Each structure stands twice: as C-alpha cells, then as structure tokens.
Amino acid sequence: EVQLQQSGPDLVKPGASVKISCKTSGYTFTEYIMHWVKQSHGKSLEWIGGIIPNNGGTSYNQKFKDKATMTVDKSSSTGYMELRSLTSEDSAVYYCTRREVYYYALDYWGQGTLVTVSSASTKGPSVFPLAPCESTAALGCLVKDYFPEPVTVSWNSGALTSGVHTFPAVLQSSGLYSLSSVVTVPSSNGTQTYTCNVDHKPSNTKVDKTVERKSC
Amino acid sequence: DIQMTQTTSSLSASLGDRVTITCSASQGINNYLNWYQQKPDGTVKLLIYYTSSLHSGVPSRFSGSGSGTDYSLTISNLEPEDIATYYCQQYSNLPYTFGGGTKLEIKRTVAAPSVFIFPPSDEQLKSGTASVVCLLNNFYPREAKVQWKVDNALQSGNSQESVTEQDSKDSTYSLSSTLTLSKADYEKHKVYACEVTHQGLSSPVTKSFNRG
C-alpha cells in the first residue's frame, strides 16, 4: 500500500523558519512527482509547488516563491518543504501529495501537518474525568487549557472507537484551547474499563486518564 | 491565474437522492479538471480525474461531467459515508487552482438527543475552576436549544458549545455545552441542570445533579 507520513504539528515564532517531512513508502520515489498544498482554517486548498525526485527540479506557485522551498532525499525516500519568514497568514495545514499519469492528478495525500505561527508559549492539556454523579451510560475526558492545536484522543489505546465523540476544540477567552471526548455504552456492557489517551506533540505531553465508574 | 468557483459552498440532500456539485473556471480548461473529497478528519481522496474518469476504488454512484468552463460532480444516490467537502481542481495552467469547496449536509429522519450531565472533577476544582458539561448524543437535525439552570436560575454568558461533524454511519450530530464557573461560585449552589429543546422531543428534557 502507498503511504505518505508527514512530520507532526509545529508551533513557530513570527520570523522563524520550519522544515516539514513527507516520508513515502510502497512505490519507487523517483518515478512520481510530489506537490505541496496549503489549507488555512475553514478555507480552500492553495497549490504551493512540485518537485521531480529524479533530479530535484521544482515548480512554484508565484504567491509562495519567497515563502517555501521544496527538496528531496532519495535514500530516506523523503521530500521536505521549508517555510521561511513566518506570519499568521502561514498558520495552516500543509499536505504533501503524489502526482500520477493516466492526465495528471494528486492520487495519494498525506494526513497533513498543522503549523501555528505565534508568539505565545506551548502549554500542555490538563485532562479531567467526565463521569456521571436509562439504557445507555456515558463518560469522557475534558482536555482543558492547551496551546496550540492539535490534540489526539483515543480510548483504551485505540481498542474502543464505537460510541466515541471527540468534540472540536473551542478557543477560550484566555487564548487557550479546550475540548471534551465522550463514550456512550449500553448500561449492560460493567464488563470493561475506560481510559482516554491524550497526546499533545507540541508539548511532548502524553496522558492516560482512567475514568472511575464507581459501580459498587 | 485561473479562478475556480464553487458558488454553492453548503448543500443539503436526503439519503437516496441525486446530488450535483458544480464548478466553473474563469477561462476554458479543456476537461483538465479533477474532483477531491475531504472527510471531516482532513483526509483527502481523489474521486474523478480528467472530468469523467472514476479513480480505482471509488463507488460508481460518483460521476463527473462537462467541458469548457462548466463541470459537475454527481452522486446518483447519496449514502451516509458521502458526508464531506468536495473540491474541483484545474490543471490546464500553472499554478494548479482549486474551487472554494462544497460541504454536503445530509438530511435524514428526526432523532432526539439522549442527554447526559457531568459535574466537575475534584482534580479541576483543586486549581480554582469548575467546568460542568452537558452532552447531547446522536440527534438530527442540528438545531437544538441548551439552557443552563443553577438552583433554577436561568444562566447567560458563562457557557460555550461545540458540535461534531455529521456521523458517517447515522448522519447524526452530537453537541457539548460547557458551563464554566470559579470554584467559589460552583460551591454557593446546589442543583446544576441543562434543559434540552429539540424537534424530536415532545417537550424539553432536563438532566441535573446536586452538589454534596
């Protein structure tokens, strides 16, 4: 299976540079062009540029010629893009993609890399249990007072997926993000335990919070 | 620099219905037009290339049409897993340009939320803030009134809401309302309650707890 694995999220200073990876697997790196796409929050896709891995030859969107610099590394089968002189307008998700011929199209896409450009400092989430004081029960995790986006939440290390809602984060008047993740279970299936697994890569924060049911 | 316009950025359709998303270019682009689907989690899939050609592993419910400036993506019968934003892309000139996106809202039968209330943890209280959460699970449609009552006093200004994207199996929404108080405020009061009004409820549902 073809696969495009991008570096993790990034907080960056105004004026700072940053270098994003796209490590490829499941195809001959040299036989396929790689393009880069930007997506601002609640926005459309802007094409940034391409790179022929065979020889390192590049095309750029005019609007990004001063901003972005693509490269490859044929040994690690890994393309990069460096963004220079960063501002708010550079706060975005950045996608690497593969071009195929049938007639050009972007036939595989990275999961995307969230870049936040800001002065303010990393802060890790506080993780609080949501437990109740019908035919279904609910519990969850409150993931409070973190910066920047994003966090990932799983339940029981990815073994509980069904009945799960991870709410999108709201920006609080404090300039810190907060969200809840919740699980519903039919009252019957008492059997199992419930632990939410929170990862904030920007702060190297990982937290497993077990939600005490207190059945007895 | 070629401009791609998706005039209708928000489209609603019932399961089973035929759905058409349109795209027009500022100048002719000779069928050099692709369609992508972005899921709520941000994953992007190519659906159609060169106007009409179905990418391998894409249901035949998807077709592409048109020529010159005007292109459409059609879904012959809408499925729940089709909830997405759809984008067109021209490759006639560089720079490659994209449409604004069309977010597909899915219409289904009314379902009332099941409602849950959660008090703050001691682990939060110990550091000076009380968050009280009210959950509305697996409802349609999206429109919902959540009112907070503290010892039966209607609240204003001290709560924030968030809503999931429409589910990919049951086309429902879930919503959280968080009531934020100082620890000191949380402790001057006994009953915390959220009252949910929704089309699927013949009268509002209240969930509450007593402190201490």
Side-chain angles (χ1 to χ4, degrees), chain A residues 1-83 85-133 135-213 215-216, chain B:
Chain A
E1 47 155 28
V2 184
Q3 192 188 308
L4 273 54
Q5 211 80 221
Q6 303 192 212
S7 51
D10 277 301
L11 175 55
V12 295
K13 274 73 182 42
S17 179
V18 62
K19 214 162 188 279
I20 298 163
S21 48
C22 180
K23 129 79 179 204
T24 86
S25 62
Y27 78 96
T28 315
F29 193 56
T30 73
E31 289 210 75
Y32 294 89
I33 284 78
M34 165 165 311
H35 299 109
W36 291 85
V37 181
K38 165 162 171 196
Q39 185 172 55
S40 295
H41 185 36
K43 241 78 193 155
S44 184
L45 309 171
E46 297 159 72
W47 182 76
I48 301 164
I51 177 151
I52 311 156
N54 182 39
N55 52 48
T58 62
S59 340
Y60 291 79
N61 178 329
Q62 274 281 81
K63 302 192 175 176
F64 296 106
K65 199 140 203 212
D66 295 319
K67 188 55 63 178
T69 318
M70 295 165 284
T71 45
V72 288
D73 181 337
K74 286 191 270 191
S75 70
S76 49
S77 268
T78 300
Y80 303 72
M81 168 162 82
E82 186 178 308
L83 302 182
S85 276
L86 295 168
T87 75
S88 318
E89 156 86 44
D90 299 301
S91 289
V93 174
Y94 293 85
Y95 295 91
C96 64
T97 72
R98 194 189 83 173
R99 200 199 77 162
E100 179 61 299
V101 193
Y102 297 87
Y103 297 179
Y104 320 145
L106 305 177
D107 68 329
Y108 292 97
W109 286 67
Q111 89 285 350
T113 295
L114 183 58
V115 167
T116 312
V117 165
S118 188
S119 313
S121 340
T122 314
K123 190 188 158 76
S126 301
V127 182
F128 301 128
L130 291 170
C133 291
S135 47
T136 79
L139 48 77
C141 276
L142 175 59
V143 177
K144 189 116 154 32
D145 291 339
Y146 69 95
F147 190 97
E149 298 251 59
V151 294
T152 61
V153 193
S154 57
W155 288 87
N156 300 342
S157 303
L160 185 46
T161 53
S162 149
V164 170
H165 294 119
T166 300
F167 285 92
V170 300
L171 188 67
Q172 301 169 111
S173 58
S174 72
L176 295 175
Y177 290 111
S178 170
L179 73 78
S180 275
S181 178
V182 295
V183 189
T184 60
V185 194
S187 316
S188 291
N189 325 66
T191 49
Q192 275 277 352
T193 59
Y194 302 101
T195 309
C196 72
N197 319 111
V198 175
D199 182 4
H200 194 234
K201 290 206 213 281
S203 66
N204 319 78
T205 305
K206 310 204 76 231
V207 172
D208 296 322
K209 176 69 78 211
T210 296
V211 185
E212 298 295 337
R213 296 172 281 153
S215 243
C216 57
Chain B
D1 224 346
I2 298 164
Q3 183 90 350
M4 306 301 314
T5 297
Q6 290 183 251
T7 297
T8 292
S9 54
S10 170
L11 188 60
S12 61
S14 313
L15 293 167
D17 281 356
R18 179 166 243 84
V19 170
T20 305
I21 294 153
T22 71
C23 177
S24 56
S26 51
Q27 68 203 45
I29 58 167
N30 300 84
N31 292 95
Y32 294 136
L33 182 284
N34 306 316
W35 291 98
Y36 304 97
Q37 177 197 61
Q38 181 165 54
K39 297 293 278 145
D41 61 10
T43 62
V44 176
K45 201 178 147 211
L46 164 71
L47 295 187
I48 305 251
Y49 60 92
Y50 188 68
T51 301
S52 292
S53 280
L54 215 68
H55 186 252
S56 138
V58 179
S60 46
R61 300 179 293 107
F62 292 95
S63 54
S65 69
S67 49
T69 52
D70 293 349
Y71 301 83
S72 287
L73 170 75
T74 295
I75 310 176
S76 46
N77 64 103
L78 189 60
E79 295 292 326
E81 56 264 34
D82 295 341
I83 177 83
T85 311
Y86 297 84
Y87 295 98
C88 59
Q89 181 235 326
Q90 74 71 24
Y91 64 103
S92 173
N93 289 6
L94 312 165
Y96 289 182
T97 51
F98 288 93
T102 304
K103 204 165 141 68
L104 198 52
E105 202 273 326
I106 295 195
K107 289 205 295 232
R108 55 147 289 163
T109 57
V110 174
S114 58
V115 182
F116 303 89
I117 193 172
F118 302 103
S121 74
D122 290 328
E123 189 180 350
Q124 194 193 12
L125 284 188
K126 73 160 219 214
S127 81
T129 304
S131 298
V132 194
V133 186
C134 179
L135 164 67
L136 277 61
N137 213 55
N138 295 330
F139 63 94
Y140 191 87
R142 175 157 163 169
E143 293 73 37
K145 218 180 76 163
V146 186
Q147 302 200 280
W148 286 106
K149 294 179 182 152
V150 176
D151 299 319
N152 201 38
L154 178 65
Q155 303 288 303
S156 260
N158 53 0
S159 58
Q160 271 174 281
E161 284 183 359
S162 159
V163 185
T164 55
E165 299 296 302
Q166 212 172 355
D167 189 85
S168 281
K169 315 192 202 213
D170 71 0
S171 311
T172 59
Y173 297 93
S174 298
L175 173 158
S176 79
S177 179
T178 307
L179 177 74
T180 305
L181 301 188
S182 77
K183 172 179 200 274
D185 296 345
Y186 174 70
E187 274 162 4
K188 311 189 293 233
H189 305 294
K190 196 193 176 65
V191 175
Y192 291 83
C194 65
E195 181 205 55
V196 178
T197 301
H198 180 266
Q199 201 199 131
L201 295 172
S202 63
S203 67
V205 163
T206 296
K207 292 303 168 179
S208 68
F209 63 89
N210 276 237
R211 270 212 332 125

